[PDB]
Every structure is written in C-alpha cells, then in structure tokens.
RNA sequence: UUAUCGGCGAGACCGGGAUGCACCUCCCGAAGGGUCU
C-alpha cells in the first residue's frame, strides 16, 4: 500500500515577475495564496497497491499487444 | 485504463591526535684444461 503522490510545486521561479504580473500595491507583490483557495498547493494522494508484477490474460495476437505494451505509452493504473 | 490538472522544495565543511619501531654477515668448495710452421 503505496500512496501515489502529487503535489504542485510553486518553486520561486514560478513565483517571480519574470514569469508574470503580480497585482501590485505599495509598490509590493501581492503574494499567492499556496495555503488554500484556488490558487493552493493542491496535495492530492490517492491509494496505490505495489505489486513486484502485473498479470492480465487476453484472447488477442500476442504480436501486436507485445509491441503495444513495449513501446505504447501505456501503463497501469488511474 | 472508470478520466482530464499538480517538480516537494529549500541550509549545512564533520573535523579535530598520533614516528610503528625495535636484532640478525648467508656463507660454506673447486685449476676448464688440450690439438694443429
């Protein structure tokens, strides 16, 4: 049981005027808000299971899904 | 692929001391000699 693990990640190149326009007052930059509302650092986790292999039987070429699966960008999962 | 999207990140000297040294003979024997203006 493995929690697969997304976070966004506002680094400070991401937070920085060369990369946009900040309202400004006082001449200040309106910081963003990463504590929560729209604009959040949306930590989502979900459930994942860790299994050392994955198995699936099929009726179908084996040809055609070998190549598929080698070199398909194709995984998984959600 | 039961949906759609999301860098985890930022900072740090691990370093500071030490002699490894102290004792031993490797020696003991022999003819390389004889053939051709």
């Given at each position: ?21 900040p309202r ?6 309106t ?48």
């Amino acid at each position: 049981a493995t929690t697969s693990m997304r976070c966004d990640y506002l680094s400070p190149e991401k937070l920085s005027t060369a990369m946009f326009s900040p309202r400004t007052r006082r001449g200040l930059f309106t910081r963003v808000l990463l504590t929560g509302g729209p604009t959040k650092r949306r930590m989502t986790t979900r459930p994942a299971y860790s299994a050392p292999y994955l198995t699936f039987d099929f009726v179908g070429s084996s040809e055609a899904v070998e190549i598929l699966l080698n070199h398909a960008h194709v995984g998984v999962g959600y």
